Design a protein around this ligand. Structure first.
Ligand SMILES: [Zn+2]
Length: 274
């Protein structure tokens, strides 16, 4: 093919969803590499000229990419589209960012359907020559995503409701916890350069000890040391790494949005003895 419509995304979750909609007619690339910390990412000149070569830039909004506004004002004549219109935000519950939208809306499979619609609408609006392809690819992919919820809901429901305590590092799982009826505990409400983490470690250690919570987790773009200290000082198992803010590379263990949701739920479920 002569040349394909070029789409660039802020991070890897959006890249994979968008690439499933784009199929063979457009190439979708993430600005951030898999594994990069996305909230406070610092773009380089390489990143700017990459977005500058695109025909469309997709971003999450909802207070995720603190770096996006400054980055985008460096780009000339490239349209952007936020992919989260129509999602009901959940407010952050604790800390300095209390009350503002929790950005991690893709961790509810139901919300992924809205991500799909907004990305489809953006691709059709900006590359209308391939509307039928974007529309059919969005339809087929939405059907897959609709089918994601049922086995996960069933698996997690076998954990007695009173025992559903999800203890993580970043409070990045609020939308998944809402869907499947978990109560939330975390070492920091949202990724940021911040004081107070060693103090919250002790506070969470209390809550683990009081409620005899069996398991604690970290996440794949942040340090596992606080979660491992929590499990060391309590009885609780270190349940491993959850996947939320990044996919892996294409030959890694979490190459797709579908694998991210499925593997995060599997790891949570195994932590509770299924
Ligand atoms: Zn995050």
């Amino acid at each position: 093919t002569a040349k394909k419509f070029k789409v660039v995304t802020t991070f890897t979750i959006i890249q994979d969803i968008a690439q499933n909609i784009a199929g063979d007619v457009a190439v979708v690339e993430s600005i951030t590499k898999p594994g990069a910390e996305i909230h406070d990412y610092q773009p380089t000149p390489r990143d700017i000229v990459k977005a500058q070569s695109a025909d469309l830039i997709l971003w999450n909004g909802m207070n995720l990419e603190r770096w996006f506004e400054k980055f985008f004002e460096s780009i000339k004549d490239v349209p952007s589209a936020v992919v989260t219109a129509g999602i009901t935000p959940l407010p952050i519950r604790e800390g300095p960012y209390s009350g503002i939208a929790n950005p991690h809306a893709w961790m509810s499979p139901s919300n992924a359907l809205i991500y799909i619609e907004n990305i489809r609408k953006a691709l059709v609006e900006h590359d209308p020559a391939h509307a039928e392809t974007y529309n059919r690819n969005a339809q087929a992919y939405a059907e897959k995503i609709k089918a994601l919820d049922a086995p996960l809901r069933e698996r997690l429901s076998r954990i007695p409701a009173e025992q559903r305590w999800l203890v993580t590092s970043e409070g990045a799982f609020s939308y998944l916890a809402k869907d499947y009826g978990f109560k939330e505990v975390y070492l920091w409400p949202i990724n940021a350069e911040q004081q107070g983490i060693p103090q919250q470690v002790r506070h969470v250690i209390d809550i683990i000890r009081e409620n005899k919570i069996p398991v604690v987790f970290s996440e794949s773009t942040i340090s596992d040391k606080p979660a491992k200290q929590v499990s060391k000082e309590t009885g609780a198992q270190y349940g491993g790494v959850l996947y939320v803010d990044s996919l892996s590379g294409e030959k890694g263990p979490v190459p797709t949005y579908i694998s991210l949701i499925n593997m995060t739920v599997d790891t949570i479920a195994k932590g509770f003895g299924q």
